[PDB]
Symmetry: C3
Subunit: 339 residues, 3 copies
Amino acid sequence: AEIYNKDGNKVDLYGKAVGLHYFSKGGENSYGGNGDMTYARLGFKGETQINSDLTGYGHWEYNFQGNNSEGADAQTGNKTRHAHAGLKYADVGSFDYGRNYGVVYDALGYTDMLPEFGGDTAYSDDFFVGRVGGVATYRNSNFFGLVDGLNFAVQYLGKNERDTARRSNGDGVGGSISYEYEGFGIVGAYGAADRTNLQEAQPLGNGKKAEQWATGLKYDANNIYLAANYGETRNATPITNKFTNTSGFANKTQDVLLVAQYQFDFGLRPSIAYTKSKAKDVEGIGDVDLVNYFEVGATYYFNKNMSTYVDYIINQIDSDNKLGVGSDDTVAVGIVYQF
Amino acid sequence: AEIYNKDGNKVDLYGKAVGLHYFSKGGENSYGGNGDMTYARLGFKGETQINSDLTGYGHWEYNFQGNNSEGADAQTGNKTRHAHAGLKYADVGSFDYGRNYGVVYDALGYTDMLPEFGGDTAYSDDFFVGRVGGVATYRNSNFFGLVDGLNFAVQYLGKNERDTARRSNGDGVGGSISYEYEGFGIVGAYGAADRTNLQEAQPLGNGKKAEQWATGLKYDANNIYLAANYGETRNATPITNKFTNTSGFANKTQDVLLVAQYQFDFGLRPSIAYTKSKAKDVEGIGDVDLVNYFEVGATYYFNKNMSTYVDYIINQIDSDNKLGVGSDDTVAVGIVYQF
Amino acid sequence: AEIYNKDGNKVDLYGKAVGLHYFSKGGENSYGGNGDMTYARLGFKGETQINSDLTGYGHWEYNFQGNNSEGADAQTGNKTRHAHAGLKYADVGSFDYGRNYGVVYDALGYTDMLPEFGGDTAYSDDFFVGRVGGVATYRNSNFFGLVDGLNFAVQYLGKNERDTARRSNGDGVGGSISYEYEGFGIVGAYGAADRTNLQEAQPLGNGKKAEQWATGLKYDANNIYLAANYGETRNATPITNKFTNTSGFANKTQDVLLVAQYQFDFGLRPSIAYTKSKAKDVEGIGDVDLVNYFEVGATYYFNKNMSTYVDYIINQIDSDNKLGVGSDDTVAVGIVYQF
Ligand SMILES: [Zn+2]
Ligand SMILES: [Zn+2]
Ligand SMILES: [Zn+2]
């Protein structure tokens, strides 16, 4: 909701409240857990007309969790998701710096359209696949105006040496190219980065360099949404050995994402998706599957502000999973207000 | 303050800044402590007209403390208080899920009108008496329109198995009935819930089931506010043995709340209240009083935005208190801006 | 950006997003560190016309850091900076209580005009030099209207006995006098406060009383900003022995701040500043320099919303520094959106 629009400066303050609950059995071995998952979000998107050819913009977004008590754990789960400012200039393109999605997410976010879950490979603080701190991203749209619907981007990932091996990264560079023609859109993205010595000093994952590339195809027209993603990572997908409490990254993963959705004119939006990410040559185990499930979901939009949804995950992970990944199903039911 | 009101969607962004200070002697043994208690709050209340008979709504509220440093403890005290969305439909009633007050608070919040203190029995994360996470609440007003001023509600309290015994709960169900006629209002509420094994594995409090019921009467007309509350709990009121640092819940409490206030036409709003909650059959001690005080207070409202207040607690707890509950008085002085 | 302005009540909701990066070598021994420093801020300033002569006001401000992950450390760096409400009455003056700047900052904030750094002596939770919790401040402007441009203030600093020795303080009183005539402004400020027993039970810093006074001169006209500050502290400047991990305060400091800036009409705003704070009679070491650097910086303002800057610190601290204070330079590059 727009709050100020004078001097060619618009500031849209937005947010939402999501009453959410996950249902599972026992949910220690659940895919997505069990219990109250209510949360809220707040943010703003500002845009200012510097001149005829230049425009400045800033974006912030925060996630306040609502499933926590008012005592010791009240702060659990709260996170800054977006924090970046930049300039959009003429037909040259755009540059921004701060916390933002990696360029691999340009192609990876194609199948991240599921009501509650989906995009399991878009980890936060995982180089290029998800939201990361300190990324300079140059994005050019319509290739300088000469070639319509043909966009690309290049990103410089800065060294983020956090105390955690999982949330750390080194210096990197990535890019993506997309092409959106008559309903369709096909994307390729790639990124490489140095690994921190803490990352390298881990039992799982061997290498002095991380790689993430992903390709995507989507159809978005005539009330149909259909997407497909394929990605491979090298020492860049976080894993955890449940049996030995061992962290680290998978030496290699092959990731497949599918989504098919039709939005009814009266509100109901059923969803069919599939997700399978299998690791290869993990230390002590070899090949394992990180995620494998079929999703059946539906969202009912009353209007643009209010909606409810159900998201059913039919977990195809087996109870023989060597990494101790959960094998049980998870059903998510939510009611969402947003502005 | 309303920020957007188009397409039959209103979003009221509100908040306040409260400069607050508690005065006490020594305040280790104070009732309410001693020192700076400044805090701020932010929230929004959105409401959308889905159709002629249906309306969606979301509410979020947060408490940013202002008495903390900018260093290590900057996050202390911050909490999400409200986070819930729901639908109000026609004369059927309303349903919402998220973090919200329990149904016992329907009758308990009658005497929670004191400037700074009061409602000492409305503990957060305490089943039905205060704000709790993951509550589905169906509330019906004017009994389907047939019987005016006669409202009731039913709530399903979901399992919240936090790491803390104090902030945890099991599966529960509660309800309330109220009747508001010509200035008056009388309420009865009740709720029961399973206790977690962590709760059950506590020195203080014995039982595999928690109970909380409360009745209330208020008069709110002719610039007079007068309220009375009586409540009983079973294994559902948090206690702490100061001498042995022992947590747990009181096996039984009998809780009495009284409030009398008159709002002068020119701003001053004196307050007279009384609070006594005594525990029974506590392990190792037996009967003890959790709170016992007389309150003398006054708030001066300049207008609807600005106000100051003084709240004096005349603590009737004695220095022989077996649980080590404080016996000293506490004076609260505050200055409040809100929008 | 103003969001509501009815019934003589204006509420300005403001904030910013700052993409920021510090560059250094190795930055363990850097002056300002090394890596992503992106952050965002949110706040509101409300003002209500109580009557013809009286006005109420509240101010809140928060700093959400953007350089943190979405995991364990997501909350790191977040702090409430402002939280205070008060009354401005006629020509008598103003009173407010809450978290706010100390009165020494009245004169100290003269040289705190640098793009990213500067005002190194305005520590938070350090009595009167920076932002502190629980301060009652009476400020009078134009000396009751009789003497134009002649302002003064008196502040009562309340006991803040935090668990940290660094973030604690005792009872204190401070004041300031300023005089702003035809572009110029000259200020004197002083404050004294009791030290906590925790503060007194520290290896570094000896005394049962803290002192902070500072004088200032600024010229702010004809697109020129030039400021000079001198301050002395007694047991009131936080120090840390890097070699022995020893905290405490400097027995005495002499602090010098200089700033010279010219704002070009087309946007560029170069900056020249100097900062030197040397400690005296520190336990085990004697005299040391806390900070010593020359700054060369420039900010380019596109408009009132958007800007970028570079801030170069030429660190004059030497690698023989007895306290282990960093000797390397630090370059800060930032891009800022605000509303
Ligand atoms: Zn963004
Ligand atoms: Zn609510
Ligand atoms: Zn302020």
